[PDB]
Amino acid sequence: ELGASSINFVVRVWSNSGDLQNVYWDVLERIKREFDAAGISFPYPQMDVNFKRV
Amino acid sequence: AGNIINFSREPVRRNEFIIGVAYDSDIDQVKQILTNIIQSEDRILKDREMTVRLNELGASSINFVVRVWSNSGDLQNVYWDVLERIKREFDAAGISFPYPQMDVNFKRV
Amino acid sequence: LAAGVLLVMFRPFRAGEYVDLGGVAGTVLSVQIFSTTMRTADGKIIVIPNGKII
Ligand SMILES: CCCCCCCCCCCC
Secondary structure (H helix, E strand, O other), rough: OOOOOOEEOOEEEEEHHHHHHHHHHHHHHHHHHHHHOOOOOOOOOOEEEEEOOO | OOOOEEOOOOEEEEEEEEEEEOOOOHHHHHHHHHHOOOOOOOOOOOOOOOOEEEEEEEOOOOOEEEEEEEEEEEHHHHHHHHHHHHHHHHHHOOOOOOOOOOOEEEEEO | OOOHHHHHHHHOOOOOOOEOOOEEEEEEEEOOOOOEEEEOOOOOOOEEEEHOOO
16 A cells, blocks of 8 residues: 555465464564664654745 | 443453553663563562563554553552553663654745 | 353354454353353453343
C-alpha cells in the first residue's frame, strides 16, 4: 500500500501454533535492528505546510 | 442470558503495561531496566511468565509490553508501584517518553 | 441444556483448547450442562451459557 506518510510492506509467514507469538516478537525486533543498521527509516507523521502572510 | 465474568474466582491475575519510548532508545537498555524493575518486586509471582519485549512500532514511539502475574489482592498496588518506578528509572536512566511527533516540510518561505 | 448436549456430542472444542466464543477468548476449563467455564489469558474466569455459544 501507498500510505499517507509511508509505503506499507506486508510480510506473511507460517509457523507452528506454539511458536507464533515468539516468532512475531523475534522477527519484529530483528526487523527494527536491521532497518536501523541498514539505513531504512520508519517515518513520523508527515505534513506539507505552505506559509502565507509572513 | 449473558456472560458472567468472574474475577474473585482465580487467586492470581495478570498485569499488562504498555510503555512507549522514543525511536532512539536502546532496546537492550530498556529491556534490562524493565527486567530489573519487575525482578525486584516481591509481589510478582516468579513462577509465572514475565514477558518484557518490543511489541509494536507505533507512529511516534516503539511500544514495549510487560506482563507479570500477582495475587488478585496485589494487582492494582503492584500496577501503581511498577508504573511509578518505571517512570523514575526511565527519567534517571535517560530513556524518554516522546510527545506526538510530526515532520513538517516548509514551502513558499 | 440442549446446546450443552450438542456441544458434548459434537466437540467443536475440548477442555484445554484455546477458543473464541463470540468476542471472548480463553482456555476452556470445562463444558457443563447449562454453561461452560473458560479462563481468559488475562487470568479471569468467564461463564457462558451453552445456548449463546451454539
Ligand atoms: C433437553 C433436550 C435434550 C436433547 C437435545 C437434542 C439432541 C439431539 C442430538 C441429535 C444427534 C444426531
